[PDB]
């Protein structure tokens, strides 16, 4: 029932206000995340400076930075295969097909394949030290290549295999959950997680390989922060600002065209977010910005209740609120709540 709700003339006013409020919070969260890295964190030094310096806490060496980088790449490869794809797959295989269909992150917009593929490109970006698919001179890839060309080539191939396997699932993944292609994508993601957390991490950690000193890894950490992390968060800030502006256009003059234009802005803003999921550490994690912007699944019953009662304060939480209160607010806001409000069955919603 909450899944079947339509945007109608009867609820349009409330629907516009829900969209405005969710888009304003996404704008705030992306700005605060970018500022935490680029300007100041916890009222002090910027997180970009703290990470690049690695002078004690939580990173005392360039190796500690790089182990976090690699751990966080392995974590997203694990999340994508075992949970984003795996949770719907295992529900479906057990015979719980209706629960499986609604378990797919980004199904409202039929965007799961592209979303999860961008998560793998986050790994590529972290490993390449770039955003354009070109291997940077100061990348982890180049460091591994100089010591072990075979391991570097196997890692680059494993990243590409996972991205290609997800793209090979027939569009949309929501309608092809039990496919052979789904299983091949899970396999490719598991192989990628393994080569990162086992082979790569162990190889860098071994002092005998001479690639874990600050002289070797400082330029890798600096380039990862300056060319990957900070520009991705800058792009997310800019694109969440544009997404809010597109929601305002739609709310002020609702039309099929304005819904289509706001949906395009949602995909545009999602890209730097999805391409940041290999670095879910530091500010995005500690500030709770990851679940603020990207909780999934949502509390769909609570969304419909908030829409009909215009209880906008239910979307927000404060420092010191208990865990349940924070999660309840996060489960009714963010990119996926805005996605619900903009899309129906993979297409922009229409004005009746
Ligand atoms: Cl989908
Ligand atoms: Mg168009
Ligand atoms: Mg997530």
Residue numbers in the entry: 33 to 384
Structure paper excerpt:
Here, we report two crystal structures of this novel protein family, a circularly permuted imelysin (with the GxHxxE motif) from Bacteroides ovatus (PIBO) and an imelysin-like protein (with a variant GxxxxE motif) from Psychrobacter arcticus 273-4 (IPPA). The PIBO monomer is a V-shaped, all helical structure consisting of two domains, D1 (residues 33–90 and 244–384) and D2 (residues 91–243), with molecular dimensions of 73 Å×55 Å×42 Å. The functional site of PIBO is likely located at the domain interface and supported by the clustering of conserved residues, including the buried GxHxxE motif. As a result, our structural evidence clearly argues against PIBO being a metallopeptidase.
The asymmetric unit (asu) of the final model contains two monomers (A, residues 33–384, and B, residues 31–384), 1191 water molecules and other solvent molecules that were present in the purification, crystallization or cryo-protection reagents, including three magnesium ions, two chloride ions, and seven ethylene glycol molecules. The two monomers in the asu of crystal form 1 of PIBO are essentially identical with an rmsd of 0.5 Å for 352 Cα atoms. These two monomers are also very similar to the monomer in crystal form 2, except for a region between residues 329 and 365 (rmsd 4.0 Å overall, 0.63 Å if residues 329–365 are omitted). In crystal form 1, a magnesium ion, which is present in the crystallization solution, is found at the mouth of the pocket. However, it is coordinated by water molecules only, and does not directly interact with any side-chain atoms. Mg2+ was present in the crystallization buffer; however, neither residue is involved in the binding of the Mg2+ identified in the crystal structure. This lack of observed metal binding in this region, despite its presence in solution, casts doubt on PIBO's ability to bind divalent ions directly. The αO-αR insert (defined as the region between αO and αR) of PIBO adopts different conformations in the two crystal forms. The αO-αR insert in crystal form 1 contains two helices (αP and αQ), as well as a short 310 helix. Helix αQ (residues 355–362) interacts with helix αO, while the 310 helix and the loops connecting to it lie in the interface between helix A and helices αO and αR.
